[PDB]
Amino acid sequence: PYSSPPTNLRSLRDRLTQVAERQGVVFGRLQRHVAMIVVAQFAATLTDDTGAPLLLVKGGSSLELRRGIPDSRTSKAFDTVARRDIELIHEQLADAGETGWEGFTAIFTAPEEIDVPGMPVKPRRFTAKLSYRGRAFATVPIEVSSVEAGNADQFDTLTSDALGLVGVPAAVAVPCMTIPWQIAQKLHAVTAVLEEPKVNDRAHDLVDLQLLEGLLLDADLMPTRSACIAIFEARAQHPWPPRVATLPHWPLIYAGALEGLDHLELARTVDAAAQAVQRFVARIDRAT
């Protein structure tokens, strides 16, 4: 246990290395995780007139927070749903990063519209360039999506002790989109059928959906069913409940997304994973 915060970036990295070995995770994953937590602390300063967050973490970053680095895929971005339009979010995020948090500071690049087949609204992507006490520490890709069907009306508050473990004591509170909404979105995405030149490549959703099933309590099954219906209705595309199919190019992609997750009970083949998520769909659909 450290008595005080790292005096500089060198000490922070040395401490991260120390915690990574003790925890048995890869240093670069832990460093990404810590940088994402730091970004979340800037994001958490964005609030409406009632103190409620303007930004909720979702996607792979949400799963990492809920399950831990060992039990989740590498998250590619700090992915969020936003209750305000991107220009306000960016302006307040940039101000938060300039003011800093526990010695960390951030510069945010200009947002850019992203293409993502199947979503009603194109998300915006940009980058946070984080420093620790004036030394470049890491860059965190950030993704921001519009609300959908009331998916930001509720949230959970996640915590990590990763920064405490390197001696940064402030409280971590990460507002996160709820598991029922997160299931609804991923179920829609993995079952969407794209225009025939384009093809659906989201075999990794079959991993995330198995991971989410492991988190869901039965008391939230009927909430999840309603959230699935709301998402499928709002998106005005294929109907609920969907058929969880696979495509011929998915096997290698599904195997890649499993990398490092063997200690879990995940379906070993992609077609087995599709049938397991199909069973999940049926369980959700019967919780009336």
Out of 33, 58, 90, 124, the residue judged to bind ligand CTP by CB under 6 A: 58
Residue 53 is a binding residue for ligand CTP (CB under 6 A): no
Minimal CB distance residue for ligand CTP: 59
DSSP 199-260: ----THHHHHHHHHHHH--GGGHHHHHHHHHHHHHHHTSSPSSPP----TTHHHHHHHHTTT
**Least distance (Å) from ligand CTP to the CB of residue 113?**
14
Give 101's strand partners. 104
CB of 27 to ligand CTP, least distance (A): 19
Q: How far is the CB of 192 from ligand CTP (least distance, A)?
A: 6
User: Per rule CB under 6 A, is residue 118 in the interface with ligand CTP?
Assistant: yes
Residues 281/244, Cβ–Cβ less than 8 Å: yes
What is the Cβ-side half-sphere exposure of residue 232, based on CA atoms within 13 angstroms? 19
**Interface residue with ligand CTP, options 88, 116, 173, 252 (CB under 6 A):** 116
Reduce the DSSP state of residue 265 to 3 states and report it.
Answer: coil
CA 196 to the chain's CA centroid:
29
| Contacting residue, 53, 60, 97, 180, with ligand CTP by CB under 6 A | 60
Q: How far apart are CA 160 and CA 126, in angstroms?
A: 24
64 touches ligand CTP by CB under 6 A: no
CA distance 226 to 236: 15
In the bound state with ligand CTP, the residue whose beta carbon lies nearer, of 93 and 231, is 231
- Per CB under 6 A, which of residues 213..272 are in contact with ligand CTP? none
Tokens of 13: 């990295």
Of 34 and 187, which has the nearer Cβ to ligand CTP?
187
Please report how close the Cβ of residue 145 comes to ligand CTP at its closest, in angstroms: 7
Q: How far apart are CA 84 and CA 147, in angstroms?
A: 9
| Residue 32 in contact with ligand CTP, rule: CB under 6 A | no
Asked whether position 282 contacts ligand CTP by CB under 6 A, the answer is: no
**Minimum distance from residue 185 beta carbon to ligand CTP (Å):** 4
Instruction: Tell me the window of 156-164, 185-193, 214-222, 240-248 that interacts with ligand CTP (CB under 6 A).
Output: 185-193
73 binds ligand CTP (CB under 6 A): yes
Q: Is residue 110 classed exposed, middle or buried when 0-12, 13-18 and 19+ CB atoms within 10 A define those classes?
A: exposed
Give me the residues paired with residue 104 across strands. Answer: 101, 132
Count residues binding ligand CTP (CB under 6 A). Answer: 16
Residues that bind ligand CTP (CB under 6 A): 58-60, 73, 75-76, 79, 116, 118-119, 185-186, 188-189, 192, 204
